Amino acid sequence: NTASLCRIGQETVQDIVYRTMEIFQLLRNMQLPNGTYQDRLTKLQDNLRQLSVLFRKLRLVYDKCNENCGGMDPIPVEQLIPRREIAEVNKKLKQKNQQLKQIMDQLRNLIWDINAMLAMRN
């Protein structure tokens, strides 16, 4: 779950940035009643809460990832390069996908057909 930690933290940073984006967005829309709307303040608060959540989350994931679980890491250079169960799940997935595509094709044909008719005389 280590690489899982890496990816999830990565996504948490995007979540940070996007939350900040929407927070400033909500702030921009604000009105200062002239009204008694007050729902604005509600969204602002409960929005600001998630940011607080994600920061502690980032601290936790950072700690767990730089924990360095017995790793004598080589510097990136020389990494740029100038299990059967995976195969089984991949095969099952590809089969299920193919069946889904038969279904999608059938529905496409039905929709083309129903369209042809009705649009012809309805």
Binding site: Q102, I103, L110
Partner: peptide
């Protein structure tokens, strides 16, 4: 006849999704 064709093709796609 239109609704008949539609119901027919629908029975077919149901059979297919059942199989999958």
């Amino acid at each position: 006849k239109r609704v008949d064709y539609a119901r027919l093709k629908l029975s077919d796609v149901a059979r297919t999704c059942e199989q999958m």
